[PDB]
């Protein structure tokens, strides 16, 4: 239905081990499609999905040029931030940035994002109005004043409402056979005895895309939220994802427990029981 494009920038200093490394990756929803790595032998924006390969030389040149410039600016910014916090030259530090757009099923912009973190902590974020900034501390206020004078917010707003949405529309059309194909999970329930009186029921979902899914156990129609172990959704390596939910039941009470599965690729939501 709805979709998103996000770019993720990480800039990492490594004192005594060369200049800071700059890595950029681009995603459409849960699919990576480009990457740039400043340590590469020949640094350039490079394809990571088939449907982006068809883009012309001016595309890869623009994306590589912007990324090369970013490599130097982020090196400047790490030096600046180290100063804002009176930090020494010995430690390694990390700027992270995420930005992009969400579009609804009509392809209209739902909202844009731009936000930054320093060493894992929120630093500065563009507000939802795409016009003002939230600075996290007095260091970030300096960055905010720099960006107001540079009209950063106006450039990002123009990008987020223009190129971001347009190219996302174009990416969704060119990769429509994968990006707009929802693969349903393969499901089943397993039974692992723990003792004479209890056993583990585990509800499995495999091979689904996109990663968004709902896996829940019920006891007598009642949700077992507190008592369900949920593993983090993990990638299979072939674009699809996996997940499981597990609950420990009194032996002999198994059939009071149901696993419920909602996913966009499912015709109908699923209800599964342990089948001995």
């Amino acid at each position: 239905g709805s979709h998103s494009m996000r770019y993720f920038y990480t800039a990492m200093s490594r004192p005594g081990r060369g200049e800071p490394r700059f890595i950029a990756v681009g995603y459409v929803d849960d699919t990576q499609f480009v990457r740039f790595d400043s340590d590469a032998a020949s640094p350039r924006m490079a394809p990571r999905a088939p449907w982006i390969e068809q883009e012309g030389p001016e595309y890869w040149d623009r994306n590589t040029q912007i990324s090369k410039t970013n490599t130097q600016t982020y090196r400047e910014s790490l030096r600046n931030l180290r100063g804002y916090y009176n930090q020494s030259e010995a430690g390694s530090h990390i700027i992270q940035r995420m930005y992009g757009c969400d579009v609804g099923p009509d392809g209209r912009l739902l909202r844009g994002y731009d936000q930054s973190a320093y060493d894992g902590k929120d630093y500065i974020a563009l507000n939802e109005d795409l016009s003002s900034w939230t600075a996290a501390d007095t260091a970030a206020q300096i960055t905010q004043r720099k960006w107001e004078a540079a009209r950063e917010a106006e450039q990002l707003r123009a990008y987020l409402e223009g190129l971001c949405v347009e190219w996302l529309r174009r990416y969704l059309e060119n990769g429509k056979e994968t990006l707009q194909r929802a693969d349903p999970p393969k499901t089943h329930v397993t039974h692992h005895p723990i003792s004479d009186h209890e056993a583990t029921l585990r509800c499995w979902a495999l091979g689904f895309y996109p990663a968004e899914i709902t896996l829940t156990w019920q006891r007598d129609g009642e949700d077992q939220t507190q008592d369900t172990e949920l593993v983090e959704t993990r990638p299979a390596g072939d674009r699809t994802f996996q997940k499981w939910a597990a609950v420990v039941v009194p032996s002999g009470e198994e059939q009071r427990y149901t696993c419920h599965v909602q996913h966009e690729g499912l015709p109908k939501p699923l209800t599964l029981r342990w089948e001995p």
């Binding site: 681009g26 910014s77 950063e152 990002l156 990008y159 190129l163 971001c164």
Partner: peptide
């Protein structure tokens, strides 16, 4: 496609 290079922090 990437946004244009932004200003330094």
């Amino acid at each position: 496609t990437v946004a244009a290079s932004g200003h330094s922090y």
